[PDB]
């Protein structure tokens, strides 16, 4: 299935197979939702963007965003991809998500914003400035 | 110092037997399936520090599996398969993946896994040592142990690395 393929390759950071999958979806050769959520125990409720942000696959995140992946999708915990990238201290992915106008004020199911879940000071301070402005 | 260790794997691979061999030096040929998830606690020596391991034993049968909320806080995840049942090795990727997204460690690439290939005392082995080692090494060098819960082979050695890596992770 094209969506199961998308979730598999995004989680594992196989950038070329992701790119091939998206350029093929762009031409309607396959039925595939770029914002699909997983149904396996291995990805339940997660988008390909979620998976690639949590596991730190920068190139997959770029290709997904450039191809129009919704930046503000939520998983069953109420986390956005920004939350996942902030949580794991991925500065360069946090920047890339801000470049695509990620909402920094979204509060997850446990009452925390992306700024509030990071341990990287450079990420916390940077999300403080944007959230100051966005709010 | 409380260390939280989760034991995952398909039904019948020997999770409960490895835990009972380690904790009570006992083994039973009779099979009694685990329901849900529960733990015991065991004092263990890591180098020269005495620590407490909270060891969670889990249901391999889907009908007895409950939620995975208890994954949170784990300091180490043990993946068990049966070397005579090759599909129990094939499920290891999804066991590990579900642990990572549900437990959500901050550093998923370095979170400590340990893989036990159990039942090396049986005839009709199907999973090659080299195959299991190559998969473990490809996941950022997961330590791999071959064990027999029945004959008590490498059980103590495995849980010594489990405790050492959980202690490092907890600290
Ligand atoms: N020969 C041999 N038998 C084993 C070994 N380990 C477990 N067994 C047997 O395999 C069967 C399953 O062992 P269990 O420990 O109950 O397996 P489990 O992973 O806890 O199974 P579930 O609770 O259903 O998830 C039992 O009959 C055990 O006696 C082993 O190392 N060698
Ligand atoms: Mg059991």
Author numbering:
A (entry chain B): 4 to 138
B (entry chain A): 7 to 72, 74 to 178
Text taken from the publication that reported this structure:
ORP1L, a long ORP1 variant (hereafter referred to as ORP1), is specifically localized to the contact sites between the late endosomes/lysosomes (LELs) and the ER and implicated in non-vesicular sterol transport. The N-terminal ANK domain targets ORP1 to the LELs via interaction with the Rab7 anchored to the endosomal membrane.. Rab7 functions as a key regulator in maturation of endosomes and autophagosomes, directing the trafficking of cargos along microtubules, and in the fusion step with lysosomes, through different protein-protein interaction cascades. Here we characterized the structural and molecular details of the human ORP1 ANK–Rab7 interaction by determination of the crystal structure and biochemical analysis of the interaction.
The asymmetric unit of the crystal contained two heterodimers of the ORP1–Rab7 complex. In the crystal structure, the GTP-bound Rab7 has a closed conformation of switch regions. The human ORP1 ANK is composed of four helix-turn-helix repeats connected by a long or tight β-hairpin loop. ORP1 ANK binds to Rab7 using the concave surface composed of the inner helices of ANK repeats and the first β-hairpin loop. The helix α3 and the α3-β5 loop of Rab7 compose the ANK binding site. The switch I and switch II regions which undergo conformational changes upon GTP or GDP binding are away from the interface, indicating the independence of ORP1–Rab7 interaction from the nucleotide binding. In the crystal of human ORP1-Rab7, the truncated switch II region with (Δ73) composes the tight crystal lattice interaction, indicating that the surface entropy reduction by L73Δ was critical for crystallization.
